[PDB]
Amino acid sequence: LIVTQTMKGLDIQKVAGTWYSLAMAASDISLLDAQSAPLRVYVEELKPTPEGDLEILLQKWENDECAQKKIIAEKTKIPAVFKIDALNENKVLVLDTDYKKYLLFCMENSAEPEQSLVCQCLVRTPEVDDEALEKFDKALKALPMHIRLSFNPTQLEEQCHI
Numbered sequence: 001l002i003v004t005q006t007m008k009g010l011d012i013q014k015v016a017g018t019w020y021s022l023a024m025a026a027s028d029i030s031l032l033d034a035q036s037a038p039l040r041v042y043v044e045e046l047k048p049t050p051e052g053d054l055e056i057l058l059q060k061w062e063n064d065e066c067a068q069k070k071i072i073a074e075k076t077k078i079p080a081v082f083k084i085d086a087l088n089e090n091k092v093l094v095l096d097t098d099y100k101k102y103l104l105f106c107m108e109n110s111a112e113p114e115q116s117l118v119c120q121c122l123v124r125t126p127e128v129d130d131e132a133l134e135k136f137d138k139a140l141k142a143l144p145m146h147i148r149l150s151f152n153p154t155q156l157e158e159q160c161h162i
């Protein structure tokens with residue numbers, strides 16, 4: 001109940017493949033602040049299952065290394081919303097995608113909204129896609145975002161973005 005965009009007609013099987021987290025933004029600086037921040041996740045691959053869940057492979061700096069992660073987000077009745085499993089009732093919404101060049105997703109908590117929201121602009125290749133960043137930046141003005149990170153091709157090709 002804070003992300004007012006959601007993609008109609010999502011073919012979740014088609015968003016499979018490798019992805020780059022070109023940009024990311026959050027509702028609070030603490031979430032994207034340092035390399036070991038909570039929602040500073042770098043996405044590598046998206047893996048839908050035949051039943052319809054979504055397996056995410058990502059990287060995240062943690063105990064001071066760059067560690068791979070495996071996260072699986074489960075199907076709901078709304079084709080563009082998935083539930084990741086943790087202590088908290090946390091939700092993934094696919095905002096938009098042409099399957100071939102970009103995907104915009106946000107990641108909010110059930111809990112308290114301005115305390116939750118993180119969004120990313122995924123692109124298929126290590127290239128700065130301006131119109132991808134246009135749609136990401138325009139889906140995001142209707143949100144209360146306070147920190148915006150953005151990465152360049154050289155960082156897009158290195159573990160944890162340098």
Ligand SMILES: CCCCCCCCCCCC
Nearest residue numbers: 041046056071092094105107
């Ligand atoms: C540590 C919990 C955050 C991981 C969430 C990753 C969400 C990426 C899914 C992209 C949706 C198509």
